[PDB]
Design a protein around this ligand. Structure first.
Ligand SMILES: Nc1ncnc2c1ncn2[C@@H]1O[C@H](COP(=O)(O)OP(=O)(O)O)[C@@H](O)[C@H]1O
Length: 255
């Protein structure tokens, strides 16, 4: 929880809106240090003390992590009003909109590298006994070098036992990850397209699973299907997902 003097922060244009408030692009210039771009997360005007505490709890969770595929907390502004959370800036924004605006414009190996980064971030979260519960391409951010990082600290992304019995675990996080794999390899198609939420639940219970996206390697779609096994203990763990994607990257004939 590093405290940042607000005079070191220059707020520029709005780049997003979340549950808490607007997110801005900005510049952070600490004394003696090279300026960097940041995202500045703000809290909607008029917030109460309880809303302030809930907002800053995002920063306290984020500050526990230090991994190249988890969004980095630069610091917080809490000595002055309004409160702000300052994170690293991700030039290409959310992964789902990034892919939908770049349909077809990345190679399979680039997309696999994106997925490997997301899986490494999730492995790290799971090792720290953090269950994300909301993993989806809209909650992954992408930087200028196409590195993907988990952020956000929804029936069609949720494992069936999390829907039916409220059992959320890292294995339900792996189900969601398989949906993210399908989002990525389809360049941001909507999972299950225009099916209703109840139609999705009923179909999954009768063993429907999403088909391979166009031009998706068979081995990548099989890994999706492994993430979507009904029995949560049959799903691969994130450590195995990373190893599988690494082997695909090392042996690209397998794609
Ligand atoms: N680090 C970042 N870099 C670039 N865009 C970001 C960044 N963080 C958030 N955004 C944009 O702002 C949107 C809302 O962010 P979110 O984390 O949901 O806000 P909140 O502070 O309300 O939780 C994101 O979907 C994304 O478009």
């Amino acid at each position: 929880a590093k405290e940042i003097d607000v005079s070191f922060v220059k707020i520029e244009e709005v780049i997003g809106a979340g549950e808490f408030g607007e997110v801005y692009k900005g510049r952070l210039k600490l004394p003696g240090k090279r300026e960097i771009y940041v995202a500045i997360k703000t809290l909607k005007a008029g917030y109460s003390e309880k809303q302030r505490r809930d907002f800053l709890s995002e920063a306290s969770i984020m500050g526990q992590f230090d991994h190249p595929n988890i969004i980095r907390l630069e610091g917080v502004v809490t000595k002055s009003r309004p409160v702000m959370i300052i994170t690293e800036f991700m030039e290409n924004g959310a992964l789902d909109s990034f892919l939908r605006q770049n349909d077809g414009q990345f190679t399979v190996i680039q997309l696999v590298g994106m997925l490997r980064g997301i899986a490494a971030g999730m492995k790290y979260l799971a090792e720290m006994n953090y269950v994300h519960r909301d993993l989806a391409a809209r909650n992954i951010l992408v930087n200028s070098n196409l590195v993907c990082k988990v952020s956000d600290f929804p029936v069609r992304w949720t494992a069936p036992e999390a829907i039916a019995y409220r059992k959320f675990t890292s294995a339900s996080d792996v189900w969601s990850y398989g949906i993210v794999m399908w989002e990525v390899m389809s360049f941001g198609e909507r999972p299950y397209w225009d099916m209703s939420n109840q139609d999705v639940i009923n179909a999954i219970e009768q063993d429907y699973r999403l088909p391979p996206p166009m031009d998706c390697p068979a081995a990548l779609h099989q890994l999706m299907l492994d993430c979507w096994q009904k029995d949560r203990n049959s799903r691969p763990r994130f450590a195995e997902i990373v190893n599988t994607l690494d082997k695909m990257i090392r042996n690209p004939a397998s794609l």
